[PDB]
Amino acid sequence: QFSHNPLFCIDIIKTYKPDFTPRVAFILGSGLGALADQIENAVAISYEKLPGFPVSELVLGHLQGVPVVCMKGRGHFYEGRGMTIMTDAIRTFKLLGCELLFCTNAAGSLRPEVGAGSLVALKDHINTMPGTPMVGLNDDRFGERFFSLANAYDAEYRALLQKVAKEEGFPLTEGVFVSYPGPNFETAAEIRMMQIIGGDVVGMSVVPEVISARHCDLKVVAVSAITNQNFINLICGFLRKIA
Amino acid sequence: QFSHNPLFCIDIIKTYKPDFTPRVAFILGSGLGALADQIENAVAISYEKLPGFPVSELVLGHLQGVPVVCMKGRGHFYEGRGMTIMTDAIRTFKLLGCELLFCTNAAGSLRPEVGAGSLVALKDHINTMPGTPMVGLNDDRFGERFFSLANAYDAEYRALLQKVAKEEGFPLTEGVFVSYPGPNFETAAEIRMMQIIGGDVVGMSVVPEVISARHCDLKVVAVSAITNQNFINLICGFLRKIA
Amino acid sequence: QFSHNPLFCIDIIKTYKPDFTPRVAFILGSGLGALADQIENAVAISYEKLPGFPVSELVLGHLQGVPVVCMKGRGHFYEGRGMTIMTDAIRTFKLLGCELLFCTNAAGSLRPEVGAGSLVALKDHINTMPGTPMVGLNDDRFGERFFSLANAYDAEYRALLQKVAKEEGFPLTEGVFVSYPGPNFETAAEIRMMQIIGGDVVGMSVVPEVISARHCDLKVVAVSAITNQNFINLICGFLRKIA
Amino acid sequence: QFSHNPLFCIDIIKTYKPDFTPRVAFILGSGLGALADQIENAVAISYEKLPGFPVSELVLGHLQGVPVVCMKGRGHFYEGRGMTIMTDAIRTFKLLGCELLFCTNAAGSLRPEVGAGSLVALKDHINTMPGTPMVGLNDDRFGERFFSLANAYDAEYRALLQKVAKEEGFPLTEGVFVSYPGPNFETAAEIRMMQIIGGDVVGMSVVPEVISARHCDLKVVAVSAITNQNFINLICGFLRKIA
Amino acid sequence: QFSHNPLFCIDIIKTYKPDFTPRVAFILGSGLGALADQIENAVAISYEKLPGFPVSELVLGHLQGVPVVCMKGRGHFYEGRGMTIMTDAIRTFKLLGCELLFCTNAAGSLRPEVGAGSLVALKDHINTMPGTPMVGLNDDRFGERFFSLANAYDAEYRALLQKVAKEEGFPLTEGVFVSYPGPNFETAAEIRMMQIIGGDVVGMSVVPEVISARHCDLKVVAVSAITNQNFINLICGFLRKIA
Amino acid sequence: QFSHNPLFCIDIIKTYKPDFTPRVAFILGSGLGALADQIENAVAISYEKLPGFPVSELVLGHLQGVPVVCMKGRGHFYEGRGMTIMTDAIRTFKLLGCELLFCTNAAGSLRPEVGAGSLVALKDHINTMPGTPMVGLNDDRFGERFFSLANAYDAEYRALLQKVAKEEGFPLTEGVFVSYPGPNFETAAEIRMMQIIGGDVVGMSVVPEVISARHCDLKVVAVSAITNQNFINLICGFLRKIA
């Protein structure tokens, strides 16, 4: 027996935003909400009206003239509902017709050279959380039993990201993201461990969403804001080039 | 309260294959079933008639004149029933009187030098799946609370494996297996991480079975078929030398 | 809904040891019980009378004239009740008024230079067990949603530990502890992995207790007895310097 | 934590049947489906698209020119999901704006004088199923902790039912319904017991729906078809008089 | 595995009310709290500090110079925690050393002759709630697997109750109590059913407490206040005669 | 997902008692074990080796030259595993090929005229336990969703029972059995209620087994030993007449 939540959400969303087919889905991490404020004809639906959504709202509309859907707030593994916490919502994005997920998140740097305030485009990841989202019976309605994470962080969209960054005057390093369960922060040794292992950025999310997206064949693009304006411009510039 | 499934299986098996004491237990991974076709006086019992067995069949008989039991199909961690999924079945092998488990599995190589089509004898492992099979109350009927994994992959049988490989004309490299939860495949970074960590082969099984076997003092021998005739000969030749 | 066990324990303990405010809390690992025998006016309460305590006793009294509470026996992740197994007990120490937790444990060395019989002061840790103690809804009564593990193993108390060791004639090396789920022991490859990762000591506990302690702002001090008199003197000398 | 299913259903229903405020809600028992075939501008929604609905469809439209909602199929206690199986659906009727529930069901007679083919208007009930629908935390959003079942089977609507029956030429006896868990049928002694107790009709449903309805202040009208055209006319005539 | 809550409560209670051995335990139903206000040297403990107690307080002290323990508030079957909801608390009364339970409760009359305002001494009961408190593994520490309810409502104490009632000028009828699950009130037919069955009073509690009391050999006395000063005098007079 | 326990038991039983097709299945209540001692070529299997069987043994063999299976010990509702506790075992009897279940049990009389020591043939029953065995998804492999209890206590076999009783010189009264959950015994009022309701005998079992038997079309015969040699003769005489 599988979840029908995405299907329910499709119908509930038609009620608040009819005849709307979004192309890009966004997940706005921590302090990144202020962007959704600029959505054209913005319609907000509380996650409490969308079954399966990570109750702590979702905003539908246009940005740079592109039909977009946004998630103001995400779910994390540390909340206690396992690695499947972001799966229904991602499946909802796929069923809505989106062609790509634009994930954003607050994170720590594992490189001295990249400090607080920097933005990092994620090119791959190392999962350290226990297990994975698709563990359990496979939902054939969304994807196959086994699946590849090769090019999970779409190389093509990443190249566009690089161009936009040029285009506006800020670095945009590319890195390997390594997930951490939390909610406690990482010990210094764990951090050294992560460097040795090959990581560049460390955080408590992303991996669940991304693996879930790949399973249902939704393309991914992810950018971390290193916490220890540029982001808005990067996003709006990316939107402009894909319009 | 503990599982009595192995005990039940012993009695159920006497009904289909009386007065039979197998010496070697096999787990035939993915495309490796065709071997069981060559078992002498083969009797097949569906896993649905054996409590505790990983319902997706078990074949009892003789091979190279050696009393053998053989699992066509195994259980994995990614199925959602935790790390204990292969434990009852291994305990059943021990109670049947087997003296060694011959585990086989499909896997990926972490060494460029060993490619698709190669066979690798596992000499050790690195567990990356969350937790382990014996976590929880200890079943004193099968083994002790704590136990060593030293020489888990029996050095002696491994040496025989090396001889047989000579004996038939194919390389038989030895490696460290590192388990991965799945069901998604590994990211490239995860793969690099595994190299750095010391691994040679990567897969989604083995570890549960092997740790379970060691706990009840069942000797182990494991060979991976790198997927990204020789196997049959290796197995039959090993059987011949232990007869 | 949260656990009230620590609160219950406070009242139950007043009954056996009234008007007593301990300053240091101890966790005596495996063969380390004989120390509790030297507690002044020792009162022993079975863990079976203390809700939340890891039923396999707790001893309250004075040592070197310092009000102390001691756990003879701890809980481990391998027992099957998850990473929260030591949390209620640590919260009980905090509510009793302790200002520091003195954790002890049996462990293996990852350095050739430090062998069986050595004592190692833990200066940091690398968690390898699945998830962490605070995963799930946060208990605001004890600590915050997020928290830092910086200086988790108090540098100050560690310096005192160094002095005492001088003071009595034995080495006291400092190391990074890396937790392992167990109950099986580590494979040799896993051990190599741990070296590469940066570890110095390996064990099956500590991490749960320590993270739990930090969450409720209880200072920590941890010493491992490498298993593959000095300990008593170190503890008693530390007590003397903090009196 | 309470169910939000009724709320979800409201939004899902707006999508298939916008600007529609039904006044009467029907539950069509066993062989009573053929009535829904006569609904004007009938829109059918499968219970699989309505969270909380007893998956074995719901039909919205007009009948005798009255805005109506109809459940083709109900849930029973014997299915194993307890006495709350019909609660979400009834709450959905209340939230849709219905002013009365018209429950129908197949049943057995406890009076010799009323035989197979007869119709009986239920005037009260005796619950024999274990417990009741509202057992557990009270959902203040729908009703109060305690509530009266006085006049549960609305006397007023029952009088209208009596008139219509005159009006078309068939008896319409009034009786006390006594619920039975099932799924087995009643023993003869149980049946005698029910007579002695004061019952007139016996069945395996009704009680859950009715108690749930009363809790959220939804008026009720119930008619049993004794199994061991008139019904259609009675319903259509009742509708005509309340239009 | 059994509940140790009563044992915990014993120790927690020693802390707030040391060297106190109560003889009578009271359960004050609905509007009956005002009595506890007259307890001598009253000590109140919130049910939130007593594990196993029906969180919606407990008062210990003397009344008519008799050591007494009171429960201001009880647990009911309709709350959703089954028929064992009052068991731990009753066991706590037994372990405290009480020799009798004085249960009180608000109830409805099944006899026209006994109306609102009347008091009825319960002489027996008919359980209509699903199952019973002792269903499941038997706790040998408190009572036997099977036990008799003969004279459950102690005839001797009931006779004293009759004398006191004379003694103060009010009727005191004796009746059979029949429990009802609730939380809804009874239908009129259910009420007729109860009359036919032999009942005199109807309510939503009592039975759980009483059966639990009998299992651990605690004597019982129960009085219902029919809701559809005398009570205080009856209680105080009973206390006086047993002092 | 359904239970396969009966199927497992079939195979396990072939191992201890091959080529054996029993015709009558017995359930020996309390003090009734001594009968199984007289089974010809008796083979005993502990319920611990038969999945689904009510662990507190099963005896297979011949009696009066009739192939028989016999349960020494049954499961009851009061044990806490619900009304399905005897279902797997009864299904096992059906699959073994039995044509009738001969249930026996210890019970109380509701008639003054029938006292301790009497035997009563059950002709019908009144279920007072919460719910019934078949509640939940129906196992089509054994029976239908709905089923009749008419002639549940086979009239034909009952007539034979009457003859045998003549034949040996003892009364054999026929009665209506009414089940009671227990484990406490019935109150006197409950007993009066049972009389009024139409019962003749009262007990804590039978109903689960019997309803389960009827569902899978197994004929039933039940005899209660009123507790508040003749039985052996009745059974052996019945066997003789059906041989």
Ligand SMILES: Nc1nc2[nH]cnc2c(=O)[nH]1
């Ligand atoms: N895990 C983790 N999450 C973060 N979010 C922001 N900074 C950090 C950090 O250093 N670690």
Ligand SMILES: Nc1nc2[nH]cnc2c(=O)[nH]1
């Ligand atoms: N985890 C894992 N399992 C495999 N089975 C076959 N190939 C692979 C691989 O690359 N990775």
Ligand SMILES: Nc1nc2[nH]cnc2c(=O)[nH]1
């Ligand atoms: N995990 C682990 N725990 C230990 N406790 C004592 N020695 C060891 C060891 O080598 N490994």
Ligand SMILES: Nc1nc2[nH]cnc2c(=O)[nH]1
């Ligand atoms: N319980 C029950 N339900 C029915 N539905 C139709 N007839 C009957 C009957 O006799 N009993």
Ligand SMILES: Nc1nc2[nH]cnc2c(=O)[nH]1
């Ligand atoms: N069940 C029930 N409880 C009550 N408490 C007070 N009055 C009543 C009544 O009529 N019925």
Ligand SMILES: Nc1nc2[nH]cnc2c(=O)[nH]1
């Ligand atoms: N329920 C019940 N079971 C019994 N078993 C033997 N006697 C009795 C009795 O009086 N009541």
